[PDB]
Design a protein around this ligand. Sequence first.
Ligand code: MN
Ligand code: MN
Lengths: 430, 431
Amino acid sequence: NWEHLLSLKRQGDTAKRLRIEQDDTRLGFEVDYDRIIFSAPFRSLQDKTQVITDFVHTRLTHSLEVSVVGRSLGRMVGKKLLEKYPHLEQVYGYKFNDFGAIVAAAALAHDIGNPPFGHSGEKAIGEFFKNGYGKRYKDSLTAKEYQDLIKFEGNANGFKVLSQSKPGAQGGLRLSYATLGAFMKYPKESLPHKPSDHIADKKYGFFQSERALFEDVAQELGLLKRSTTDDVSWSRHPLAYLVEAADDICYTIIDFEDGINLGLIPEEYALEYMVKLVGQTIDRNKYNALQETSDRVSYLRALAIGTLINESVDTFMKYEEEILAGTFDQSLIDKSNYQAQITDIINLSIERIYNSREVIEKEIAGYEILSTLLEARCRALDNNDTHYNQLIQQLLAPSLYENLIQICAEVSTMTDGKALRNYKKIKGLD
Amino acid sequence: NANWEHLLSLKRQGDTAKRLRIEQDDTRLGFEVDYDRIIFSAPFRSLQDKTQVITDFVHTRLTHSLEVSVVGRSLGRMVGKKLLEKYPHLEQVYGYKFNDFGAIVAAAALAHDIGNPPFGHSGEKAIGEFFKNGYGKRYKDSLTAKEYQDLIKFEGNANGFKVLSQSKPGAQGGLRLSYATLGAFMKYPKESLPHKPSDHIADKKYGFFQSERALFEDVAQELGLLKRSTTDDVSWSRHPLAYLVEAADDICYTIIDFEDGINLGLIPEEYALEYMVKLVGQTIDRNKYNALQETSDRVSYLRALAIGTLINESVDTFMKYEEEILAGTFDQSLIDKSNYQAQITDIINLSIERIYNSREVIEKEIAGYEILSTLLEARCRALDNNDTHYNQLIQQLLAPSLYENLIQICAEVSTMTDGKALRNYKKIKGL
Ligand SMILES: [Mn+2]
Ligand SMILES: [Mn+2]
């Protein structure tokens, strides 16, 4: 039921929270958004770079733009869901802005747990425990606990960041269970690894240390079981599809916009790649009167995102029943009529942005930086008596699995600067 | 009308007797020795640390000068062989050989950038701006109209001529290049005034400072260059070989600026074949081109071919208008008559839009104005009050007739490496 998928429950609650009795000015889904804005992990995205270190393409702005596109998807789908299921409003008190707030909040947080240097940074963490120093702990861990480490996922670390208990602060940000369900693109544990080619099975979404929490979330939401073994898996909260579409749309279109502004993509290619996405709404005469490259391409970007938002709303509603029953197999953007153009855009970005010498140089440097910090923390964990390892603990961080996963969580959330600075000190270089 | 027997003079400054070509040792031929004198000279060596517009560390003025001198040697060899067919007595009676023309063009071309200030034509303009509106405006009423014009329109070509010929104690005549080489060096045989008397390319700039006028008068008289004016404002018709030095330079900066910009990313690689297909298609091996897997290899194949095409045509243009050049009645450059002027123009235009107006280049030239002004001001203030403790410090640091002093300060600031210039500038400024 959509009634259960829209849970306002917060972790530790002993009583049901009913939608009809909420204060409109203090609606739990919108409180969630505010809690994220003011959280220290979201603020740290100011000093985190998406791919190009130009200092004006942060992960903060990306997260903001994804949440704006999310609220728009949530509002429009919300309005149509309330027309399809009128009891949801007339009896339970839901409003279309509710679905915008849930999608907006989970999208705002989607990037929050990811390590620096993108996918290279996840792979360096994993390689540290698969083949580097962290190999030694394998025999002291369960198969799923070790799999958390060798296949470290920033999505799962995001879930940990949002919900981690600390003294005086149990339950992290304590977001609504609907918001956490809309956050979880991959509602499975680290094993079994990729049991199918379903998008929800391409990674996993929570570490073992958050397993008990997501169990409580999935039971409250009423997510459909995808496993009846001790390897737990569930079908995605419907709104998670909208969070994913917001991110899909922004990375595809805005990465391209960035590449052109940066010079990595010749501006001559702008209209060729965008014409199908914008061709019926573009005011060509206004496009030609624009005098700056950055204005022409942001005009194209707004047209394309508009096109892809309207279509994604319509794809969600064409497949809503399948999504509610956990039988939908793809992403919304996979069903797009512009799939081929989207793929050409993404491939051009891989060729001209992600495989440029500057980006490659950053990732190679990232591997050493993270590998160094992980070894410094893990040796300090093994022999915490020596003077050097007392110092290492005071500089970076003032059960074995709980310890190792916390070290990954902490190295992962370090800003680009502090990582490079602490790495520089450990290696002596300035 | 000029005579090829006098235009090929082996005279060096101060010579008391004539140098006949027949009497030369071919192992120590005057024109070839000119090339070595340049290679080994301090001003040429300093081009190692003098960057062009782009500072990739592998785009130097030494490489440009080298490649211009190579293309120049080819131009002069091929024209030289055709000139000896037309005028056989030059070999039968005077003993000239076609490699002589190759050597003259090659030595003049090699030296053509030797006197330019750093930072391009922006460097020249920073110096002029200094004397036109900066601290150096104060000298206007103590200089002649033409001494002041030398300064406010300071010209790297004219500074070049000074570098090659400047007398010093124990070194009369500078490098003492052959007069034929000095004649081919001089793309603009005129004084600083009058400014742009005509639209001829030879009238666009000027070629020698007042301090060097008497010197070029000697060169022009010996070569027998044709007097283009006798109004007390001296100018001559260009030595014919000067058109080839110019053509070699024109060819290289047109094609190799394009290549460089493609390699640096500033010009999409697609434009390479698009602007160059007319210039290469009669000579390109398509099979070879489509096998080359690296962009740098493809565009340098195209560049080698485009340059070959333009050398061959430039030789033809010279030989066609040879009699008009000898009469001083040829009004254009060799490249202005090329049948690829449409293609050359589009190349030059794209290079300007994507390279010369790129943000990196604009930035380097703006900082150059500040670096050159600061050095010129420290030098001129030290000249004006040599008595203060500071100006005596400045004198020990930067340099251990009023017009001669000012032009020498200009020559010295202009010939500084980018390293010494920036380091000395930073020192003056406390950085
Ligand atoms: Mn994202
Ligand atoms: Mn040149």
